[PDB]
């Protein structure tokens with residue numbers, strides 16, 4: 123197929139189905155290598171580090187398939203998207219190096235913002251007439267991404283697409299769909315892979331569920 | 343714990359329980375990156391490449407726990423165990439580089455054999471009074487390892503332990519258990535990760551099931 | 563050791579790799595993207611050397627911060643490659659260490675500094691904290707001198723600077739890092755998140771731009 | 782096209798020239814603690830090895846494109862070079878849309894002693910393109926006779942890829958078709974290269990000091 127470049131933020135019109143992580147599946151602690159200082163604070167491993175990398179590699183492939191022959195500006199939503207973002211660039215670089223047929227005019231430009239609606243970033247005025255690809259780690263209620271796309275309309279961009287690693291199946295979801303989705307995960311608080319609980323558990327390579335002890339230990 | 347070093351080949355006395363791959367689960371083709379030349383010959387992806395490495399990383403951890411501060415000789419069963427073997431060495435080296443308390447007399451020595459009982463190797467007499475760890479890719483009926491352990495007992499080795507990446511749940515299984523098991527997989531013919539079908543699909547990074555077209559296509 | 567607390571001095575700084583003047587590799591030696599090959603003179607430092615050096619820097623950094631929480635600051639957007647690579651090996655050390663405490667590790671922070679302008683969030687939370695600044699390259703050292711002085715306004719405990727490349731420019735103001743990777747000749751380099759007009763960031767190797775490259779991506 | 786003159790290296794691209802007396806000291810990279818007192822210097826970092834091999838795999842695929850070729854791993858010193866080679870070879874095949882499962886690579890494993898060969902029948906290599914993967918070329922005697930031994934099984938072509946070639950005055954003039962590094966006349970270990978079965982697990986290519994030779998002498 124010839125894929126149209128996505129330009130309807132929240133719709134996910136031609137979005138491919140993500141990996142469906144069923145309710146109450148995964149692996150126990152002793153299955154993979156988990157840091158000793160985190161071992162007593164984790165219920166179970168939801169998604170192994172290797173699966174994440176393998177999925178993102180396919181996401182990077184899907185993204186290149188639709189942005190083939192156009193330059194696009196990626197926006198990293200600090201600081202939870204850092205792991206997802208860097209892995210994405212890694213596999214994007216690999217694609218540009220192993221398929222040939224390439225032009226230094228159809229590549230990507232890195233941008234970094236922090237969203238809390240208030241924005242800590244650069245001017246973003248240079249995004250006019252540009253293809254924007256938003257890189258978010260996780261969608262819960264969809265409030266953050268909904269507000270952010272309206273704020274971005276103020277800079278007169280050409281298109282807005284959203285890639286997301288995890289979508290939580292929360293009933294509080296407002297219907298905001300990403301155009302490139304990695305995983306569909308249960309309604310549980312997850313940590314690891316740059317996803318945190320009070321700035322802890324970011325360095326955990328696997329996606330895990332926090333137990334009662336972890337929440338209590340690192341509570342503010 | 344204080345672990346005894348295993349010396350009862352086929353018993354799996356203190357074997358830790360492996361990952362249970364259930365019947366009729368896995369991922370479709372469009373989930374991960376599959377080579378275009380193999381895509382029409384694969385039913386589904388059983389185990390992603392990343393899960394394999396993450397489990398093997400833990401196996402190397404489990405292996406080091408019982409062989410800590412002891413020299414042991416690893417035996418690679420060519421040519422299907424190659425991938426498992428290389429990954430095992432990578433993470434073993436990883437452990438040695440990230441530990442201030444080790445000695446060059448407590449490491450591992452590589453040996454390579456070909457089993458078709460016919461054995462293609464070098465001496466095997468140098469294994470006298472040595473700790474031996476057999477590295478097998480997959481145990482099906484358990485006949486190969488049962489005879490091989492008897493033949494290996496002719497060289498007066500100290501101990502014989504077996505690590506295995508996949509054990510198939512075949513009713514024809516003779517009860518041979520490995521001491522370090524990675525995955526327990528359904529009774530289906532799998533390929534990928536150095537596992538072949540008529541010397542094909544070895545270069546496939548994921549563990550997959552061949553469809554009917556694939557079996558017919560590469561039949562001799 | 564002692565934990566460094568004198569930004570610009572490099573009191574106990576270890577000697578870095580000295581990349582000599584007029585050495586490196588030609589284009590056909592390593593893998594270079596086809597779209598950048600005609601715009602590159604030579605490969606100065608291979609991608610693999612970078613990873614191996616950073617892996618050692620992470621070891622030196624953990625040696626002095628062992629049992630201490632420290633805050634790493636990524637100086638966007640050129641330090642990104644260095645920063646992510648640094649965390650990878652730091653996690654690696656923490657993941658195999660049976661003598662660690664989740665209260666004593668590292669905390670990530672991100673700032674954008676241009677020449678002096680600061681785009682960030684709080685940094686007031688760096689009070690009574692050990693600060694480790696992660697910079698990709700030191701040229702004249704002016705940006706880092708003002709930033710370390712400005713950072714002194716937040717009453718932090720310590721300020722240490724780790725740097726991947728230091729250029730031997732006669733314009734150097736004498737600012738020394740505490741953890742240096744390479745000492746490079748006075749030439750304009752690109753690759754490994756180092757750019758020329760937002761280009762060449764995706765280049766895995768550290769390379770020198772030719773005259774055509776300068777003209778092509780000129781503004 | 783396909784190299785078919787073993788030992789000549791007719792169209793071999795010149796490799797990286799590691800000059801006499803360059804490299805890095807111990808405190809430069811990560812070295813295992815049980816090996817630090819037994820190593821003089823680091824000659825070639827592990828990363829340079831991988832990056833060079835990645836380019837070698839590219840060069841190899843350029844000439845074998847659209848044809849089946851059989852790779853031969855000379856155990857057990859070529860294991861490191863071989864596994865990395867297959868990694869990047871697979872890497873190319875996984876991102877290429879013009880590949881054919883009829884035209885890829887087939888792995889073989891032989892063990893060479895000093896000339897006797899412990900392997901399979903090798904009769905399945907009849908009329909096949911063969912690529913020999915050797916860890917190091919010193920005098921070139923071992924590889925010279927093996928090519929003669931392999932040419933009796935009626936193979937189509939014989940090409941040789943080598944990671945390191947030593948500048949020893951005892952060299953017989955045997956040239957490889959795909960060369961990684963040209964290294965000085967010194968005994969190196971690491972990256973599956975051994976000294977009495979030691980230092981194989983060493984990720985960097987290093988030079989053994991006098992104490993190390995003394996320590997692990999048989």
Ligand SMILES: Nc1nc2c(ncn2[C@@H]2CN(C(=O)CCP(=O)(O)O)C[C@H]2OC[C@@H](O)P(=O)(O)O)c(=O)[nH]1
Pocket residue numbers: 199200201202203260261262263264265266267310311312313314317318319
């Ligand atoms: N570790 C975890 N984090 C979560 C979880 N659900 C949400 N979140 C996110 C919490 N969180 C932050 O910590 C923001 C600051 P940073 O950590 O730097 O990205 C925002 C939440 O992301 C979802 C929002 O975008 P949304 O609700 O508007 O869709 C979760 O189950 N675990």
Ligand SMILES: Nc1nc2c(ncn2[C@@H]2CN(C(=O)CCP(=O)(O)O)C[C@H]2OC[C@@H](O)P(=O)(O)O)c(=O)[nH]1
Pocket residue numbers: 419420421422423480481482483484485486487510530531532533534537538539
């Ligand atoms: N790809 C796959 N291979 C399999 C499968 N079941 C068995 N096997 C193995 C087939 N096979 C070989 O091809 C031997 C040659 P090599 O491939 O070079 O190691 C031996 C089988 O391994 C199990 C025997 O040791 P056992 O029956 O005695 O326990 C399978 O479901 N998929």
Ligand SMILES: Nc1nc2c(ncn2[C@@H]2CN(C(=O)CCP(=O)(O)O)C[C@H]2OC[C@@H](O)P(=O)(O)O)c(=O)[nH]1
Pocket residue numbers: 637638639640641676699700701702703704705706729749750751752756757758
């Ligand atoms: N590609 C290259 N970039 C360089 C080079 N020397 C400096 N620089 C840096 C150029 N540069 C920027 O592009 C700033 C924006 P960003 O790329 O997003 O961090 C600042 C320079 O960094 C040195 C300052 O810290 P300093 O002057 O205080 O020592 C160089 O030889 N090549």
Ligand SMILES: Nc1nc2c(ncn2[C@@H]2CN(C(=O)CCP(=O)(O)O)C[C@H]2OC[C@@H](O)P(=O)(O)O)c(=O)[nH]1
Pocket residue numbers: 855856857858859917918919920921922923924967968969970971974975976
């Ligand atoms: N670690 C090191 N190993 C070396 C060195 N020079 C040679 N060699 C090789 C030593 N060696 C072996 O140990 C054979 C067994 P294996 O190690 O399992 O392949 C053979 C030598 O390879 C060169 C032969 O092909 P050639 O001399 O006939 O040209 C060296 O400077 N360091």
Ligand SMILES: [Mg+2]
Pocket residue numbers: 199202203258259260
């Ligand atoms: Mg977020």
Ligand SMILES: [Mg+2]
Pocket residue numbers: 317318319320321
């Ligand atoms: Mg959070």
Ligand SMILES: [Mg+2]
Pocket residue numbers: 419422423478479480
């Ligand atoms: Mg087998």
Ligand SMILES: [Mg+2]
Pocket residue numbers: 422537538539540541
């Ligand atoms: Mg087989």
Ligand SMILES: [Mg+2]
Pocket residue numbers: 637640641697698699
């Ligand atoms: Mg900078």
Ligand SMILES: [Mg+2]
Pocket residue numbers: 640756757758759760
């Ligand atoms: Mg710049």
Ligand SMILES: [Mg+2]
Pocket residue numbers: 855858859915916917
């Ligand atoms: Mg050899």
Ligand SMILES: [Mg+2]
Pocket residue numbers: 858975976977978
């Ligand atoms: Mg040897």
